[PDB]
Design a protein around this ligand. Structure first.
Ligand SMILES: CCCCCCCCOCCOCCOCCOCCO
Ligand SMILES: CCCCCCCCOCCOCCOCCOCCO
Ligand SMILES: CCCCCCCCOCCOCCOCCOCCO
Ligand SMILES: [Br-]
Ligand SMILES: [Br-]
Ligand SMILES: [Br-]
Ligand SMILES: [Br-]
Ligand SMILES: [Br-]
Ligand SMILES: [Br-]
Ligand SMILES: [Br-]
Ligand SMILES: [Br-]
Ligand SMILES: [Br-]
Ligand SMILES: [Mg+2]
Ligand SMILES: [Mg+2]
Ligand SMILES: [Mg+2]
Ligand SMILES: [Mg+2]
Ligand SMILES: [Mg+2]
Ligand SMILES: [Mg+2]
Ligand SMILES: [Mg+2]
Ligand SMILES: [Mg+2]
Lengths: 334, 334, 334
């Protein structure tokens, strides 16, 4: 009856290599195997109207069958919506925060990358309780011009890190001839639990980002810049103190090429600097170069290596790990 | 070849609006998105015999991807059985309590309702370890006459609220010309842990209900009345004390219409009164009117609003919420 | 596009009968209902090369929908790999040890059996972080001659029971005209947390087993013999101390017949004895006879009974359970 639903997923055999047991590395050390399961469906309601829904789950494959069986298991996405011919889509539930419309540009590495797209972090990553309106080609009048607004409902959780107040954010993008340019901005109230943390001071959190990319002829090139206020979560590893960076400035870059025979090498740089952090001043949160590659056997099977050359120094005042990490992956997906 | 199984699910974007906080409301306040996933299968073994099984899970969509990720996640149903031609069906596992053959009559609202069909609550909701026998049209000899019996095995759990002793229950119903009537009753042993609770006293739990319904010509009218002894779970928020109501008296009413263009308005009333509650006597547990509507775009897509006009008063002796609660939902299902 | 993926699972209505709880039985008492869900996929990359992946999850059906909802839920398998023409298969993730290549011989009972194939126990059961290479028919040159090697990456977990160090293990088998013979062995480092336990002492865990089987003409006969040194997990029930048996010796015998009409009687014997147990000396871990049966209605539906005649005596120095257990099961699978 014009419903299309496709159960999807992957099994990801994954191993991280880092110094020691990886307490002072970028990614850690050991087994990091996991699996994904989801559905994605879409129903033709009439000529002009589609309904749709999606759910996606993370099942870790590197816990025992003992008491730790559920460590890092979670729902990543859960949302439903309606899409109306020449007017836009509207969805609600657990979904990507708008500002990920910009950060998605550089979140293209075989394993790492994407460092500033925190989950449960306002308009940066996948969160809870968002209403999202999206528009393609400006109601159909302007090919390549897209925009979105997103309404974030307050989530007063048990942890400051996973909480938020009410907020609004949005995004505008233009694509033309393989190039793409995009800007995204959100702000939200911070909750009383966030204000009580040692790190971070202010009533509102803000995040913004811009992106430029070239995505054509088997070349992928992209850059993202942005900044945040009272929005980037941080932990002092020395004091076990936590909260949010009063300011960050963040800059990511990525260069890839896709060979017809399956190989797709990747080169990147990422740097995120916190400022005005209490007791500290300026610090680096992320600072690295990346070399990697993915080999695609076909649409269902790939392998990959991903090497993070970590520029964080062993000095780092927040305890951010300074050692390198290499990831090795085998993936079956459907 | 012989076998039919169909993966099923829904994604529900869901939001509740109450004063506060929602501490003092019927339903709470904020994001309540969730998803469901299940399978349902039937195999033709021969001409007279079919095997079947069902599993159903709830994935909350309004938790973070942190330490609270698993909150409210659970298996709803997990059972397997055989259905023999003129004998009946026999199944075992986690399934609906028998007395829910009565309560289902009124559990028909867009979001709320069904207030007395508690889970893990002897016979009124989905419970563990039930062997259920069911019969259609009295061995095929009496059109519209159905019955069932169910054996509940002891579950001594860590919690009095989620426990039970051994029990037996059943249900009888007759349907004719769009009308339906149905009686159900179960009784069981209480566990020591339940007897140790300050609220509620008795060796035995009991629950019964009767149902009346009209279900034709696009009209749905239904009413349930019931009582319980030592069965309905309760809390006194003034004392942080818990247990079970020595007695309750329960009445639910529902009226709905289905318009061919998809709109289905709903009107309801629910009162549940506890009696003989230690240090209190009588006290309402539930008391409200409902108005709502579901808009069905088709078999896969729907939206709804449900408004609960809460008649509980701010003097209620157990601290039961007195504020209403409006729910708004968007549903993709397959 | 040359991909075949099956979603699969089962619903198992399951009940165990034992004296009392029974806190002193082989298997326990009460509702043991569960379900499984998994996918299994295979993609033809080219005429000589296949990709594959598998995920499998256990969903308990005997928990309430309260705080205990998650007890016993776990990923059993999560792996992906490549299979090349005659050269062999390579996979990584959570998978069966390499010593279960032998123990699978007798792990054939309707419900029980398989006592020495502990999960998260080096090479005997399902684990986390294994790299497994497998070869059939010695590169296509010797019909019926198969072998495998497996590399076990260290998992330092919160618990001694679920930890391992790095190890290697392997297996070799040979089948000809319904007869089968197998040998398997592995060794790995113990972790410091393991060595810190009062029970067990040694740098290295080791496990080995051999198997003979006849599997033809509806007869199934199999035997396994095995030993372990610092690998088999134990608890002293009197003193509440835990660790690993310094040694064990294990025998598991099985006989079954498959009638064409669906019945499949089973008879078994299992004994595992620990030696050099701190504070104790020699003591039986498992000692029983089995007598059960499985009735297959078809490929999707079965029932079974499994009766374990426990020869553990009430004298057991470790407090191992001595009473019998009977299981009754109903299974829908797809
Ligand atoms: C169908 C769900 C209703 C979505 C509204 C959620 C409210 C979030 O916005 C908060 C205001 O800023
Ligand atoms: C008590 C039942 C045990 C039956 C064992 C027979 C196995 C025969 O060896 C396999 C060839
Ligand atoms: C020793 C048993 C001989 C059975 C002869 C085959 C005819 C089929 O009858 C069995 C059908 O009923 C199935 C009931 O199984 C549940 C145990
Ligand atoms: Br995926
Ligand atoms: Br994160
Ligand atoms: Br559903
Ligand atoms: Br029920
Ligand atoms: Br309703
Ligand atoms: Br409930
Ligand atoms: Br299965
Ligand atoms: Br191909
Ligand atoms: Br185990
Ligand atoms: Mg773990
Ligand atoms: Mg502060
Ligand atoms: Mg600030
Ligand atoms: Mg460095
Ligand atoms: Mg009492
Ligand atoms: Mg009121
Ligand atoms: Mg020791
Ligand atoms: Mg005995």
């Amino acid at each position: 009856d014009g419903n299309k639903v496709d159960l999807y997923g992957k099994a990801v055999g994954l191993h991280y290599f880092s110094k020691g047991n990886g307490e002072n590395s970028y990614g850690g050390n050991g087994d990091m195997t996991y699996a994904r399961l989801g559905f994605k469906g879409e129903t033709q309601i009439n000529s002009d109207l589609t309904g749709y829904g999606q759910w996606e789950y993370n099942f870790q494959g590197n816990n025992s069958e003992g008491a730790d069986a559920q460590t890092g298991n979670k729902t990543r996405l859960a949302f439903a919506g309606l899409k109306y011919a020449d007017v836009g889509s509207f969805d609600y539930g657990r979904n990507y925060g708008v500002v990920y419309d910009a950060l998605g540009y550089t979140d293209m590495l075989p394993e790492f990358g994407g460092d500033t797209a925190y989950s449960d972090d306002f308009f940066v990553g996948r969160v809870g309780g968002v209403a999202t309106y999206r528009n393609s080609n400006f109601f159909g009048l302007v090919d390549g011009l897209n925009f979105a607004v997103q309404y974030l409902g307050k989530n007063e959780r048990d942890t400051a890190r996973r909480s938020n107040g009410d907020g609004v954010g949005g995004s505008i993008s233009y694509e033309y001839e393989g190039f793409g340019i995009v800007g995204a901005y959100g702000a939200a109230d911070r909750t009383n639990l966030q204000e009580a943390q040692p790190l971070g001071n202010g009533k509102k959190a803000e995040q913004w980002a811009t992106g430029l990319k070239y995505d054509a002829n088997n070349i992928y090139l992209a850059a993202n810049y942005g900044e945040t206020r009272n929005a980037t979560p941080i932990t002092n590893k020395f004091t076990n103190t936590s909260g949010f960076a009063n300011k960050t400035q963040d800059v990511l870059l990525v260069a890839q090429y896709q060979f017809d025979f399956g190989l797709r090498p990747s080169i990147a740089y990422t740097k995120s600097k916190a400022k005005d952090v209490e007791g500290i001043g300026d610090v680096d949160l992320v600072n690295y170069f990346e070399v990697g590659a993915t080999y695609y056997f076909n649409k269902n099977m790939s392998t990959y290596v991903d090497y993070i050359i970590n520029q964080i120094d062993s000095d780092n005042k927040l305890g951010v790990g300074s050692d390198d990490t290499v990831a090795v992956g085998i993936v079956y997906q459907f």
